[PDB]
Amino acid sequence: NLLETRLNV
Amino acid sequence: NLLETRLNV
Amino acid sequence: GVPTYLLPGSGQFLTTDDHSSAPVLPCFNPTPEMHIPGQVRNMLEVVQVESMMEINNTESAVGMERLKVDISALTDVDQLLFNIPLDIQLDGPLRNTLVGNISRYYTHWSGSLEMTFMFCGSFMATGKLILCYTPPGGSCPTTRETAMLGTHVVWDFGLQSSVTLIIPWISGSHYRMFNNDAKSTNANVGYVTCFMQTNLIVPSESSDTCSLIGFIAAKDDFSLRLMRDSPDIGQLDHLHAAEAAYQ
Amino acid sequence: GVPTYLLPGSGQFLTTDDHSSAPVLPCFNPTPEMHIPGQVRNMLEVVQVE
Amino acid sequence: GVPTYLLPGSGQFLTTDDHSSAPVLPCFNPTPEMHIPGQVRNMLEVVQVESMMEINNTESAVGMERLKVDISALTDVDQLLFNIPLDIQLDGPLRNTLVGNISRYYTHWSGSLEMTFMFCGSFMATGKLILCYTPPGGSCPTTRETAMLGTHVVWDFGLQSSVTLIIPWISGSHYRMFNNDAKSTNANVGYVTCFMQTNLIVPSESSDTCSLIGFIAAKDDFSLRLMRDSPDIGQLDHLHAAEAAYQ
Amino acid sequence: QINFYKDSYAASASKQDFSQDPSKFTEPVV
Amino acid sequence: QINFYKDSYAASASKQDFSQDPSKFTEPVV
Amino acid sequence: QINFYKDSYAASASKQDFSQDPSKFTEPVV
Amino acid sequence: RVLQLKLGNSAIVTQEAANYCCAYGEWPNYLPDHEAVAIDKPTQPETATDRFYTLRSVKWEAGSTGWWWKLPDALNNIGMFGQNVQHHYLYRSGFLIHVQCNATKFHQGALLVVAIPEHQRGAHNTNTSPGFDDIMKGEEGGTFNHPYVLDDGTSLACATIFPHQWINLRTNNSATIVLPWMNAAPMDFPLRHNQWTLAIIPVVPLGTRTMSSMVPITVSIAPMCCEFNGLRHAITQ
Amino acid sequence: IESIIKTATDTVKSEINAELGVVPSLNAVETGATSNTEPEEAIQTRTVINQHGVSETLVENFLSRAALVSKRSFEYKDHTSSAAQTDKNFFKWTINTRSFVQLRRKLELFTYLRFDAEITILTTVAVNGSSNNTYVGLPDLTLQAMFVPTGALTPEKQDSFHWQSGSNASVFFKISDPPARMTIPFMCINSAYSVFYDGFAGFEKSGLYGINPADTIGNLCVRIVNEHQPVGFTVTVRVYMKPKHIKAWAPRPPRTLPYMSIANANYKGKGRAPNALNAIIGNRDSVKTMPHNIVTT
Amino acid sequence: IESIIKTATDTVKSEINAELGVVPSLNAVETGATSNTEPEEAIQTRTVINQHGVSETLVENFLSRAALVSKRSFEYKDHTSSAAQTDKNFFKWTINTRSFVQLRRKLELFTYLRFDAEITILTTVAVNGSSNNTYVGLPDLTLQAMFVPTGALTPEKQDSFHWQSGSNASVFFKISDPPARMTIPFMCINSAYSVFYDGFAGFEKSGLYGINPADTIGNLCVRIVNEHQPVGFTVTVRVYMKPKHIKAWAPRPPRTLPYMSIANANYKGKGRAPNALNAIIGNRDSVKTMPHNIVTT
Ligand SMILES: *[C@@H]1O[C@H](CO[C@@H]2O[C@@H](C)[C@@H](O)[C@@H](O)[C@@H]2O)[C@@H](O[C@@H]2O[C@H](CO)[C@@H](O[C@@H]3O[C@H](CO[C@H]4O[C@H](CO)[C@@H](O)[C@H](O)[C@@H]4O)[C@@H](O)[C@H](O[C@H]4O[C@H](CO)[C@@H](O)[C@H](O)[C@@H]4O)[C@@H]3O)[C@H](O)[C@H]2NC(C)=O)[C@H](O)[C@H]1NC(C)=O
Ligand code: NA
Ligand code: NA
Ligand code: NA
Ligand code: NA
Ligand code: NA
Ligand code: NA
What we know:
Chains J, K: This is Genome polyprotein. Chains J, K: It is found in: Host cytoplasmic vesicle membrane; Host nucleus; Virion. Chains J, K: Interacts with protein 3CD. Interacts with capsid protein VP1 and capsid protein VP3 to form heterotrimeric protomers. Chains J, K: Belongs to the picornaviruses polyprotein family. Chains F, G, H: Interacts with capsid protein VP1 and capsid protein VP3. This is part of a larger assembly, with 2 copies of chain A, 3 copies of chain C, 3 copies of chain F, 1 copy of chain I and 2 copies of chain J. Helices cover 13% and strands 0% of the residues of chain F. By secondary structure, chain F is mostly loops. The longest helix of chain F has 4 residues, at 23-26. By secondary structure, chain I is mainly β. In chain I, strands 3, 4, 5, 7, 11 and 13 form a 6-stranded mixed sheet that branches. In chain I, strands 9-6-12-8-10 form a 5-stranded antiparallel sheet, with no helix packed on it. In chain I, strand 1 and strand 2 (10-14) form a beta hairpin. Chain I starts with a strand and ends in a 6-residue tail after the last strand. By secondary structure, chain J is mainly beta. Helix content of chain J is 5%, strand content 27%. In chain J, strands 3, 5, 8, 9 and 11 form a 5-stranded antiparallel sheet that branches. A 4-stranded antiparallel sheet of chain J has the order 4-10-6-7, with no helix packed on it. The radius of gyration of chain J is 28 Å and the shape is elongated. Chain J starts with a strand and ends in a 46-residue tail after the last strand. Chains C and J meet through strand 4, strand 6, strand 9 and strand 13 of C and strand 2, helix 2, strand 3, strand 4 and helix 3 of J. The structure holds a molecule of 6 linked components (NAG-NAG-BMA-MAN-MAN-FUC) and sodium ion (6 copies). The site of one sodium ion has 7 residues of chain C, from loops.
């Protein structure tokens, strides 16, 4: 998810 | 209520 | 073994408790400290910094216009310019300030306040104003000869741009108290009023209308107690993307 | 850990008990004392008045 | 008796706890200690030993062939030979090494690494190579005049068989962090590249193709923290003969 | 007496002030 | 204050640093 | 550290031996 | 009231200053050996990088909302500072900022000049985060959409908690601020994170009844104690 | 200049003043300093000895309170026919302080923070209320909560071999116990957490603004350990966080407009004042109108 | 040379070198020693004072964690008509570390080990889900666990006179208690356990390779103490082991291919890489291909 990776889907 | 504000309704 | 017995309160969870508890990661070494600018250790350090009052809280003032008061030349003597309510717990010109925002996490307060005003007209503009604080007991004064009987300063515009009015702590009790009642003898602070002492006088090439910015802060005699959830924030739903924390 | 056992009376609430208990408001500073006339410390002081 | 009360956490079982507990066999005498070679006391002792990198991780290389890189004479100057990704948490040439295997039981790491290369051609073979480390920020370099701007060593083949490249700790933060994201500013280490500095030159009776073996280890500035279950092992079923323990 | 809390107002009751002066109620005259 | 754990980060809260310097926010001028 | 049992093997874990010698694995040569 | 600043081959004088501000009471310095992380010997260019650079001027109009620039982003392509940024993985510095605006004794107006640490912007009336081109403006900088809430849902009225000065046209014609290194790490990659944002906001609008003239605002910035680590080939934005 | 302060400041007695060249009520706001005018310089004062304490506004007291950070409800039952999106007797949560607004606004008063985190887990159960079911009593279930680092592999089903927890920390607890409790250390790769982050945490141009994964503490993976019963129940798990051993830097303007999203600082405001985009304070009729004016009769 | 090490090593500042007869970057791998080249000899360095701790990689911390070693489920009921192979209200287990792979791989990093073993026993229950049964609530049963030495006689039925436990240690515990706990001492006939054994532990040629019964700790014999109820239940027992007071010798290459059996080191590998017999690391297209290469636009 975005909190772990800072990528959107 | 009257105990918090000392006003009657 | 040791003979023992359990007290009332055994097994409860109190959110303000203070105990040691089991470490998740044994033998863990946290990252070394390094110096960082701007450390804060008591919230009373923040409360002593000046911030802008929203004095022009009126239906026709939009955005940044709410943060300044405009003054112009008058043709009658002794006239009232504006007034400010002083109750630091309630909504009003003082609420969205450093002192207002921090005070609304607490329920009781004590100590002196200062208001500072800056003149933003041209260099060629001149004038004198009187700033008054009236202790509580009845209605806000509407005339200069009533208001000048209270605490006041007379301000001359000049090379120094700005003036301070002290609002001294004058209270029967050690603290004032946040009820939801503005007219309580435990809550009401009195009033601030501003009048012309002379007139705003400018030459033809200056702007005929000039502005004041007003600021507020606490002195180092100030104190706060009885912490509570702030009334300045709240929610009725989960925020956008809140389900993503479970994915 | 410490080996322990519970006595008879464990978990009861007795209205005449005398123990410490958890503070609701941490770091709270109560209002300073000032002198007030007419302090009373034993109810036998009142009983001696006509 | 002693007056007592129970805290939150009473009766829980935490797998990382540390307490005394009741002995099953009272008055038992364990077997005397004797000296045994090779005692280990910190896992950082194992991590400092060199082990082979799997640089040739390609579809056509089978078994032991994956552990060596073959080089041959070239007819163009300055040519690229191979490159190595450096992210010690991820799958790749570094993963199945003493430093790789132990690091994957942890989540954070810090400190310097060394790569050592051994030449395995004939005595009559000669050549020079350049080994480069590039700090992160963009794409891996494809040309010698780009790669030589970074940290590097120039290696001459001779009576000493082997050379060391130091990969120094160069990081903004005290530790790097195992996300599952190779392109993170908290995880990426940069690149290693190898180029011809001259050429591989051999006589007609030597083999025309010669091999390198590459090794990696940590220095004694290295550290690991935040332990976790290793991703290198797992099961979907009970093993064969597991029911026999209940017979 | 057992008290491990940080704030002094958490403590047990105070049953040890034996001082008196009846004369403030029985003899308030010159 | 009671702490039998081996790691110092397990301990109770630290409520005893009364040091201040308002002047880094109120007077940041020469 | 709390231990009221009579046998020493009942005790809590031993996390305090910081001694090392890498050279028995890194430099086993004359 | 009167001030001279001198760094490298550059000097600035002003006859109408109002003291100057040192952020949080601290002054720039090089990274000491007990706080360091990267082991390579650093590049320290001194007078090649530690000097005033002047940006394009902007026009103060009756309807202006205010202006902003991000650091180090606004300097990453200028002079020998830009060349050292493009060839190294890591950077560290302080800054000295000087803001200039003059008008006649018949003009009125007031500017807030404020340096904001970690100014993470919000977008208006959408759930989607700001894009790369909303944030990375370079030398040109940007303008405020909603200065009354600082473009982040907070407030202009409380912005005086940050390092700041005012330009009040009847009082002074310049503002000066000194900034230390301000980050959770000892060094950073300069092409992806900005430590500071300079903001200039017209709280009292420009006014006069005299002859109309164009009234510009001008920004000069000097890096202080620059250091660079991890040398390699050049990468630009 | 640093000093030790335990109470509010005393007041000194003061006299008449009339003195050329001296004007303590005048100030220069343009410098950026706050006014240094004292009460003794503005009015005649008495002597006052001030005994008011300042400890309830210490930063450790202000932030060190257990606040709600997660609430999750799921069905405990035979999941053989459930859809792909359902929590099938277990769930994953990424630890964050972004989702419940009272803790979020308090942490956002600062730019950088360093703390250890005390975690408390509270569980409750109820019988499923569909018309096939009577009430039957409530089961004393065992639960497992496993800590997993940011971005690492998590379990895919209730009976996965991943729950063997060979190096990960796990806590096992029953519904009849007091709430479970443990402390997570300050785990950042930097010397402090960044509360706000003005950048893009990747070497390419493409990803999200303003999120740095180095500030994400980790994951909790939670399951019921018991097999399913013949009847269904609903289980709710609540997580509380208390910061402790706190250091804080660079105070900030408070949030005024409502929060929109966990991911960013985006804004819209209320439809009308207070807390609207164009008006934060509620209106009055004019700058001469006193809103709570006392009427005497 | 032995020494006390509590933190990672410091770095010293270094200058330009140009010196005949001296080549610290050249080495002789054929000797079997690891390279002794230091960073100060390879590049110009600064001074750095390193405060990073090394305690989380101590052998006692690495191995001393409670891990799952047995899970057994059985039916609590009237067993009058059950088959000969069924667990009839009791079971036998031989203590081993061979069956759950996370603990097995960690112990197999070493050749010899000496430790005491802390044993924790966790029990859960559910109503049998056949269509004759409604839910009814759950019983608070008493269980007995009896220690029996390797190869000694074990009980044959739930009500056997062998459960009288006249010299064997037994622990009695209820489902409503915290989990049961006890410590077993280091019991080997030798000075350490053998993790691997290259031999045949019998004087004839005929038996199994690689198992030495001197390394088998013992048996747990477990029963429900209560008589059967009128309705059936399923009971599950989980056993956890934590090693403590540890010494370890002669470190080894880690397991790469999946385990096949509890009895031996036999291997097969995955069908395709990673962890296949002919390829341990996952493939890339060539030795010049960079797999996570950063793209700038
Ligand atoms: C993460 O990415 C999310 C997905 O982004 C889209 O998909 C990717 C793959 C790319 O193609 C990308 O370029 C796309 O943008 C992103 O979520 C999206 O965010 C936008 C902007 O807020 C949403 O747009 C708004 O949509 C509503 C209508 O919603 C209905 O229809 C959509 C399908 O079109 C359904 O999915 C919804 O469930 C609803 O049924 C519009 O009303 C709204 O405004 C318009 O209307 C008003 C007047 O009412 C006008 O004033 C405006 O000018 C507009 O004309 C927006 O258009 C979009 O719906 C949403 N998509 C999805 C699938 O969620 C997310 O924001 C990113 N996250 C972060 C943290 O950045
Ligand atoms: Na009130
Ligand atoms: Na990663
Ligand atoms: Na802000
Ligand atoms: Na005092
Ligand atoms: Na050291
Ligand atoms: Na082997």
